[PDB]
Amino acid sequence: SSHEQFRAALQAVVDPGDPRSYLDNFIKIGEGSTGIVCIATVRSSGKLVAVKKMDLRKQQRRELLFNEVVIMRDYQHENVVEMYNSYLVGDELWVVMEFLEGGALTDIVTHTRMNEEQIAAVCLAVLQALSVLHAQGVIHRDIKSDSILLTHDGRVKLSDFGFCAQVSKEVPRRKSLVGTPYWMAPELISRLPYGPEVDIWSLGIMVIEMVDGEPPYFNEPPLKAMKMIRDNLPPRLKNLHKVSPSLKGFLDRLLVRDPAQRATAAELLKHPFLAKAGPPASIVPLMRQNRTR
Numbered sequence: 001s002s003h004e005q006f007r008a009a010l011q012a013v014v015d016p017g018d019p020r021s022y023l024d025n026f027i028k029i030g031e032g033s034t035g036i037v038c039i040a041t042v043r044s045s046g047k048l049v050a051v052k053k054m055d056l057r058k059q060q061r062r063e064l065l066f067n068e069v070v071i072m073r074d075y076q077h078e079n080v081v082e083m084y085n086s087y088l089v090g091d092e093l094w095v096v097m098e099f100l101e102g103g104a105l106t107d108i109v110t111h112t113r114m115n116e117e118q119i120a121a122v123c124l125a126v127l128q129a130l131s132v133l134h135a136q137g138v139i140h141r142d143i144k145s146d147s148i149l150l151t152h153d154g155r156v157k158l159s160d161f162g163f164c165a166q167v168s169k170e171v172p173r174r175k176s177l178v179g180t181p182y183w184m185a186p187e188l189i190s191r192l193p194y195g196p197e198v199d200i201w202s203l204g205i206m207v208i209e210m211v212d213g214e215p216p217y218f219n220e221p222p223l224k225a226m227k228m229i230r231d232n233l234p235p236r237l238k239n240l241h242k243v244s245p246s247l248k249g250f251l252d253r254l255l256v257r258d259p260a261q262r263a264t265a266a267e268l269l270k271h272p273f274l275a276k277a278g279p280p281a282s283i284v285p286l287m288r289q290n291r292t293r
C-alpha cells in the first residue's frame with residue numbers, strides 16, 4: 001500500500017512516541033482543509049496546547065504534510081505559531097503547538113468591524129512574519145483570515161503552513177495551483193511560475209476581508225471566482241468610502257496584477273499606513289470573549 005509506505009516515510013521525520021502519554025482532555029476547537037485542531041491539557045502542568053491532527057488518507061497531496069515539519073524544524077519566529085513536536089499517531093500526523101487562545105481572525109472579520117489602527121496592527125505583524133519567511137525563500141501560499149491567530153493579549157501569529165513551498169537560486173519559482181480560490185494571486189490562477197509576491201496579493205484580499213467582512217466574489221462558486229480574479233482588474237472595496245486615503249494607498253501596493261510591480265513585504269514594512277498600527281492591546285476588544293463583556 002502507498003499508505004503504509006507513506007506512514008513509514010513520515011515516521012522518518014517526526015518525533016518518536018505518543019503525546020497521548022502526556023496530554024488529557026482533547027477537545028475539538030476547529031478544522032482546516034488538511035485536518036482538525038484540538039485543545040489538550042498537559043497533565044503535569046495544566047498548561048494548554050493545540051494539536052493539529054491530519055489523516056494521511058484524506059489529503060489532496062499527502063506530500064504537502066512534510067511542510068509542517070520543515071517549518072517546525074527551520075522557520076520559527078515571534079509572529080509564527082510555535083510548533084513543539086510532531087508525531088505519527090496511527091494513520092494521522094499530529095503537530096503539537098502553542099495554543100493561540102485569542103482564536104482566528106476569521107471570527108473577528110465575520111462578527112465585528114475593525115478600525116484602521118487594528119487593521120494596521122494585523123498587517124504589520126503579518127508583514128514582519130512574511131519579510132523573514134520571504135527572505136528565506138519560504139512562500140506561505142494560504143494567507144487569509146483563518147491563517148491568522150491571536151494570543152489572549154492580542155499578538156498576531158501566522159499559522160496553517162500546510163501549503164507552503166520553498167524557492168531558491170536552483171528553484172527560483174513555483175508552479176503549483178495552491179491556496180484558497182478567493183485569495184489566490186492572478187499569476188498563480190494563470191499558471192505563471194510565481195514567487196513570494198503571491199502572499200502579498202493574498203494579504204491584500206485579507207485587507208478586503210477586514211474592511212468588507214468577506215473576500216471579493218465570495219458569492220460565486222470557487223472555479224468561477226478564480227476566472228474572475230484572472231480576467232478582471234484588481235477587485236475594489238465594497239466600502240471604498242469608509243477607508244482613509246492612507247489605507248487605500250497601502251492596498252493599491254498589494255492588489256497589483258503584475259507581480260513585478262507589487263510591493264514586497266520589506267517595502268511594505270515602511271509604508272505610512274502601518275504607522276497607524278496599534279499595540280496588541282488594541283486587538284483584544286475584538287475577540288469573542290471580550291466584545292460581549
Ligand SMILES: CNC(=O)c1cnn2ccc(C#N)cc12
Nearest residue numbers: 030037050097098099100103160
Ligand atoms: C481556533 N483556534 C485554533 O484553531 C488554534 C489555536 N491555537 N492554534 C495553534 C495552531 C493551530 C494550527 N494549525 C491552530 C490553533
